[PDB]
Design goal:
part of a larger assembly, 4 chains, mainly alpha, Transient receptor potential cation channel subfamily A member 1 (chain A)
């Protein structure tokens, strides 16, 4: 196979033979597949023998195999944290080699926890961040790979980003400093966008990232709504203060309404000045209704219109302004979840109303046919609205059933009561108890991961902004460091147990095979 | 066998509704038979959408609650 | 509530229980539970043609009766 | 709420189990010669138009482990059975 007795001695880790072979000139040969002996000491992590090799000649930390790997890779693959610490104790170079994968990434693909704890805790660390190749097909940054595989190593890395001094003793000046040099690399927010795609919630609740989002929020994110929503609120309020300060009947054409009339008119065509808004299709049809009927409302600034069509256009206007204003509060924090719940139930009900509109059509026609001569069932599309108005428990039953029954105005009396107890079972109880049960299942689904959802919403908001704002403006507003004065699991538990058991049974193989070897080579005379 | 009794009601009262195509009937019994007809047509039409994909689950939920309530209404009818 | 409260104030002004804002908006708050009157508020004015915008009001009403008594009150149960 | 969450517990399986019931109820009614031209058995698509099995996998690895420990321990009994000693007596 190519092996030379220095390599096998380092393969099974016996320090006393590897020192004497080096004392009798072992000459550090490379075998087939290029595995010099320090790779064998790394593959196994026999650090005592590794101390022997390093203290003699040092012409092995630079050797590459036929894969081009160093022994830092093979110590990281088998995950021997004492070995890499001994290797990083000396000046050991790092290369990307025939896979364009580096040393730190290779520790992460084998998911070895303890070595990358010791990597960041050791010195000579920041250049290992910088040595990851850009535009690599499998692993661009190491920090996004740490998000992809080992989140707890990211957590202790974030623990090094946060500083303290004078620990709440005077409590009037208390110093807390953060560092955000890790959350950068162009493409924005890459260390944080990786957290939500690998849905690592504890890293998002880590107080470095909360202060990191609060930096993006206070620099421009809170200012973004004040230019966005504040424009819309400038379109909103002069519609609303117009409708209160005039009666809904008459038509208009003092010294407060004329400026109010033009103000919604300019903001409507300001909405038409954009085909799409600058911040990233329910709102597209909604604003299009909003922008049409706003102009038609204040159209008596230019041409006379009848008051009937004017106020009709105001009805669609003021209803849909505040409806879309509810959609502008969707991208907030304290008010954000209740819109998301509201749209899920609305999307649940609207994909359910294509089913139960026939249920309404059944009772709607059957009440139209049973009790025609009453006024509230005098027509279809009056019987079917009344049936929709009786969904909640608004069955009238006195002026609709009893007071006509005792004067025998019921056409089919035994049928109508039989329809009614069928009705009062069907839509107010079993539909409305179905329709509650869809809500509780959907809201608990939302509240299952709501804390991740509002953060994933908020990091979406900045990344949708960051590809729109010019980068020269970014350069002065980013701070990348804060100074804070406060005086103003069961799945990964078993998964960690699986890797320890799989390592255990692998250690039992080499033990059993070696125990086969003592039987293969042991003399016997007395037992024969 | 819910549809078997349902169509059997559906098929009787349909004929009795349009029975003035052949023999004259009073209007009171005619429209009475139309009331059972148009109510149970759309009720069974809800059962034909049961075997669909986008509309399928809401019938299955509707029948479970109805089977829950109807095995409960033998108790609370005394209440 | 401000959307339907003004929209009912603008659609059916000439009734007494919507005769003013902060009377239309309390009545809209009182119609949260299923207290949509619908007889003396919609039907009995419609058959005498006292509705100013009839196709809009019913279109507002089925939008209303969906929105606040069902999906808000079923949201608000689901938070409980 | 208890019954709907029971339905939504396995609804995605339920609508599929409903749909495969629908075809199999049909397929034993349609004549097989009509089936022969309408089946295609190949498609061409243009888009431009767990915790239980985790422990269960761990049980089989542990049960194999303790079985490997039996043959190891029995063989380790065998080296004691056949090994000479003089100095320790």
């Amino acid at each position: 196979h190519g092996m030379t007795p220095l390599h096998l001695a380092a393969k099974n880790g016996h320090d006393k033979v590897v020192q004497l072979l080096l004392k009798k000139g072992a000459l550090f040969l490379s075998d087939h597949n290029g595995w010099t002996a320090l790779h064998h000491a790394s593959m196994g992590g026999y650090t005592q023998t590794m101390k022997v090799i390093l203290d003699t000649n040092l012409k092995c930390t630079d050797r590459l195999d036929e894969d081009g790997n160093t022994a830092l890779h093979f110590a990281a693959r088998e995950g021997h944290a004492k070995a890499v610490a001994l290797l990083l104790s000396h000046n050991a170079d790092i290369v990307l080699n025939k896979q364009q994968a580096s040393f730190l990434h290779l520790a992460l693909h084998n998911k070895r926890k303890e070595v990358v704890l010791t990597i960041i805790r050791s010195k000579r660390w920041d250049e290992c961040l910088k040595i990851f190749s850009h535009n690599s097909p499998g692993n661009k940054c190491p920090i996004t790979e740490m998000i992809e595989y080992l989140p707890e190593c990211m957590k202790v890395l974030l623990d090094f980003c946060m500083l303290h001094s004078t620990e709440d003793k005077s409590c009037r000046d208390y110093y807390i400093e953060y560092n955000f040099k890790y959350l950068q690399c162009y493409e924005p927010l890459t260390a944080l966008n990786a957290m939500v795609q690998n849905n690592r919630i504890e890293l998002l609740n880590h107080p470095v990232c909360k202060e990191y989002l609060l930096m993006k929020w206070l620099a421009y994110g809170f200012r973004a709504h004040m230019m966005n929503l504040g424009s819309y609120c400038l379109g909103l309020i002069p519609m609303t203060i117009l409708v209160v300060n005039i009666k809904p009947g008459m038509a208009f054409n003092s010294y407060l309404i004329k400026t109010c009339m033009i103000l919604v008119f300019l903001s409507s065509i300001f909405g038409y000045c954009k085909e799409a808004g600058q911040i990233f299709d329910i709102s597209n049809v909604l604003e299009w209704i909003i922008y049409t009927t706003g102009i038609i409302f204040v159209l008596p600034l230019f041409v006379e219109i009848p008051a009937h069509l004017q106020w009709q256009c105001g009805a669609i206007a003021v209803y849909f302004y505040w409806m879309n204003f509810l959609l502008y509060l969707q991208r907030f924090e304290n008010c954000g979840i209740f819109i998301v719940m509201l749209e899920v139930i609305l999307k649940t009900l609207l994909r359910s109303t294509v089913v139960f509109i026939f249920l309404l059509l059944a009772f709607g026609l059957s009440f139209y046919i049973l009790l025609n001569l009453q006024d509230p069932f005098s027509s279809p599309l009056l019987s079917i609205i009344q049936t929709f108005s009786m969904m909640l428990g608004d069955i009238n039953y006195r002026e609709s059933f009893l007071e006509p029954y005792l004067r025998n105005e019921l056409a089919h009396p035994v049928l109508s009561f039989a329809q009614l107890v069928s009705f009062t079972i069907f839509v107010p109880i079993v539909l409305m108890n179905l329709l509650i049960g869809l809500a509780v299942g959907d809201i608990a689904d939302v509240q299952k991961h709501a804390s991740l959802k509002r953060i994933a919403m908020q990091v979406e908001l900045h990344t949708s902004l960051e590809k729109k704002l010019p980068l020269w403006f970014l350069r002065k507003v980013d701070q990348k460091s804060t100074i804070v004065y406060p005086n103003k699991s069961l799945e990964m538990e078993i998964l960690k147990q699986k890797y320890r058991l799989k390592d255990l049974t692998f250690l039992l193989e080499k033990q059993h095979e070696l125990i086969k070897l003592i039987i293969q080579k042991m003399e016997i005379i007395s037992e024969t």
